Structure 1
Amino acid sequence: VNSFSGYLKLTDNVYIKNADIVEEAKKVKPTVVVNAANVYLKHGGGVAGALNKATNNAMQVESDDYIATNGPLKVGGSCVLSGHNLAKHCLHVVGPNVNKGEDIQLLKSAYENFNQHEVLLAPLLSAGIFGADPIHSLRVCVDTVRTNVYLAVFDKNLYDKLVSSFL
């Protein structure tokens, strides 16, 4: 039993809700919140910009030190950093950005990072400003993640479409 509330159950392990991931994280304080990161951990917009703003830019400060030490992530890769005031940990995961020409096949590799964590609050990878089809992202999530994932979808219209079209 966990503290997530109001989710629709899609499969044995995947749950979905129309919610602002920032507000959901502040309420649940999950062990792991997933950020829709880029390889530079520059949290400018989309989910990343919103999560970073909610930390009063502390996420960005921590991230800049991480990059100065380690260099950029790989597309499809991840790193674990602090969750600040939102969660115990933040798993920064880099899905391919279609608006940069990156290979959508890397979306499965990106979701594989979730399997290192028993329970996660997460957005749909590569959705929103990353330019992929969110219906496809949900399919890859369900077919790749085996741990318990609670998906927050900000847009109510998109949420209804994701549910109604789910196979």
Structure 2
Amino acid sequence: VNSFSGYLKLTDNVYIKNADIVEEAKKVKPTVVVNAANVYLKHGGGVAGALNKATNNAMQVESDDYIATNGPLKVGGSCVLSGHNLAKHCLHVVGPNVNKGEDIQLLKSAYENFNQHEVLLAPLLSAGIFGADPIHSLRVCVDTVRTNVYLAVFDKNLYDKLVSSFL
């Protein structure tokens, strides 16, 4: 039993809710919140910009030190950093950005990072400003993630379409 509330159950291990991931994280304080990161951990907009803003830019400060030490992530890769006031940890995961011409096949590799964590609060990878089809992202999530994932979808219209079209 966990404290995630109001989710629709899609499969044995995948749950979904129309919610602002920032507000969900502040309420639940999950062990892991997933950020929709880019390889430079520049949290300018989308989910990343919102999460970083909620940390009063502490996420960005920590991320800049991470990059200065380690260099950029790989597309499809991840790193674990602090969750600041939102969660114990933040798993920064880089899905492919279609608006950069990045290979959508890398979306499966991106979701594989979730399997290193027993329970996660997450957005749909490569959705929103990353330009991929969110219906496809949900399909890859369900077919790749085996750990318990609670998906927050900000847009109510999109949430309803994801549920109604789910096979």
Smaller-chain TM-score range? over 0.9
1:96-116 residue CA offsets vs partner (Å, 9 max, x unmatched): 000000000000000000000
Q: CA deviation at 1:148?
A: 0.0
Q: CA deviation at 1:5?
A: 0.0
Q: CA deviation at 1:45?
A: 0.1
With structure 2 as the length reference, what TM-score do the two structures score? 1.00
CA distance in structure 2 between the aligned counterparts of 1:24 and 1:96, rounded to whole angstroms: 24
Q: CA deviation at 1:67?
A: 0.0
- SS of 2:81 mapped into structure 1: strand
Q: CA deviation at 1:34?
A: 0.0
CA distance in structure 1 between the aligned counterparts of 2:68 and 2:80, rounded to whole angstroms: 16
Q: CA RMSD in A?
A: 0.1
Q: Which runs of 5+ in 1 are unaligned?
A: none
Q: CA deviation at 1:13?
A: 0.1
Q: CA deviation at 1:88?
A: 0.1
CA distance in structure 2 between the aligned counterparts of 1:57 and 1:33, rounded to whole angstroms: 16
With structure 1 as the length reference, what TM-score do the two structures score? 1.00
Q: CA deviation at 1:143?
A: 0.0
Identity of aligned residues (%): 100
Q: Which runs of 5+ in 2 are unaligned?
A: none
Misfit runs of 4+, over 4 Å? none
CA distance in structure 1 between the aligned counterparts of 2:2 and 2:40, rounded to whole angstroms: 33
Q: CA deviation at 1:42?
A: 0.0
CA distance in structure 2 between the aligned counterparts of 1:47 and 1:3, rounded to whole angstroms: 22
